Amino acid sequence: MDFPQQLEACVKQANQALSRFIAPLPFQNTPVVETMQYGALLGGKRLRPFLVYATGHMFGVSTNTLDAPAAAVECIHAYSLIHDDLPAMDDDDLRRGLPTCHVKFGEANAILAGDALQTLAFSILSDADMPEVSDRDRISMISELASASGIAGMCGGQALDLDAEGKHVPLDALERIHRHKTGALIRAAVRLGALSAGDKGRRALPVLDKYAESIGLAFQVQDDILDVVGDTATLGKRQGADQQLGKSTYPALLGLEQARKKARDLIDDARQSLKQLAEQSLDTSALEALADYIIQRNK
Numbered sequence: 001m002d003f004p005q006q007l008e009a010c011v012k013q014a015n016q017a018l019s020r021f022i023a024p025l026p027f028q029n030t031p032v033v034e035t036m037q038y039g040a041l042l043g044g045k046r047l048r049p050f051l052v053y054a055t056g057h058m059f060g061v062s063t064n065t066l067d068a069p070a071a072a073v074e075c076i077h078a079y080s081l082i083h084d085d086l087p088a089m090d091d092d093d094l095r096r097g098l099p100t101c102h103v104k105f106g107e108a109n110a111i112l113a114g115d116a117l118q119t120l121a122f123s124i125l126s127d128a129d130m131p132e133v134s135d136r137d138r139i140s141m142i143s144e145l146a147s148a149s150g151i152a153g154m155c156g157g158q159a160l161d162l163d164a165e166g167k168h169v170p171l172d173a174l175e176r177i178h179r180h181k182t183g184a185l186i187r188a189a190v191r192l193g194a195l196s197a198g199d200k201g202r203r204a205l206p207v208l209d210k211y212a213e214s215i216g217l218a219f220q221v222q223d224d225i226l227d228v229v230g231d232t233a234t235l236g237k238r239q240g241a242d243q244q245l246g247k248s249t250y251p252a253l254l255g256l257e258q259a260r261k262k263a264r265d266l267i268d269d270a271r272q273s274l275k276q277l278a279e280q281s282l283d284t285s286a287l288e289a290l291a292d293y294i295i296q297r298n299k
């Protein structure tokens with residue numbers, strides 16, 4: 001019922017999960033591991049873990065087993081931001097209210113920490129305790145995180161994003177960028193939550209996919225909107241960063257009003273998909289509240 005309290009509960013759960021998977025690693029208290037801990041744990045809304053937990057919870061899977069996919073997806077997410085902020089990429093000096101990884105620890109440490117966080121995601125999925133999760137479903141989790149994170153998803157989208165700098169690409173190309181760079185990982189969170197539930201989760205996938213696809217695109221449209229109108233102290237990252245690099249964005253192409261409308265229509269579409277699940281007596285309340293927050297949030 002109370003969404004801010006659920007978000008904070010999720011932040012604590014996910015941070016604990018991440019910390020536990022990071023703690024047995026060697027080279028604690030050296031720069032690369034400290035970079036990983038800074039970039040993964042210090043700040044962030046943990047909405048992808050939120051998606052993993054909320055989805056798995058719908059099928060009655062234990063929060064403790066969901067710690068694994070929640071932490072894995074957040075490792076990929078964390079890695080993606082570390083590399084995204086690099087000078088050769090978006091060259092941003094602030095994130096989550098603090099110096100970016102490459103500023104505080106140097107570029108080499110940032111590259112390697114992001115590299116290692118990606119690897120850790122796959123160590124988590126292959127090694128972590130998930131008692132109710134069949135090997136078949138664990139393999140599917142790994143396969144999904146891989147396809148969603150790599151050239152067919154997030155990385156591919158990062159390449160499209162970089163290519164579209166200064167090119168003011170049309171809506172169809174814009175959507176392709178956003179769905180890959182941001183949509184794909186968000187859909188992986190939902191899929192990993194569902195796969196944790198086995199066959200019952202798999203049966204929901206056609207519908208959860210449509211939900212995930214809509215909130216995932218909406219997530220990036222809101223990110224672009226926030227880049228224009230948000231305050232740096234609230235965002236935790238610099239307002240007007242996109243405009244400075246000439247990024248193809250929703251607000252740059254369509255203006256702020258039409259971008260907002262696109263985000264709102266995507267969320268209404270996400271809500272519609274969830275109605276199909278609520279019909280089968282699955283509790284969609286956390287997923288609908290998350291869907292609304294994705295476009296109501298100011299950070």
Ligand SMILES: O=P(O)(O)C(O)(Cc1cccnc1)P(=O)(O)O
Nearest residue numbers: 080081084090154181182223237
């Ligand atoms: O947090 P950022 O840098 O505004 C962003 O959302 C970061 C990001 C990195 C990787 C994939 N998706 C988004 P971006 O696309 O560079 O606008």
Ligand SMILES: C=C(C)CCOP(=O)(O)OP(=O)(O)O
Nearest residue numbers: 044045046047096182220223
């Ligand atoms: C994929 C995108 C839009 C990058 C930022 O995601 P978030 O806005 O979830 O960033 P944090 O909460 O993790 O800082």
Ligand SMILES: [Mg+2]
Nearest residue numbers: 084089090161
């Ligand atoms: Mg970027």
Ligand SMILES: [Mg+2]
Nearest residue numbers: 084085090092
């Ligand atoms: Mg960026």
Ligand SMILES: [Mg+2]
Nearest residue numbers: 223224227242
């Ligand atoms: Mg952005």
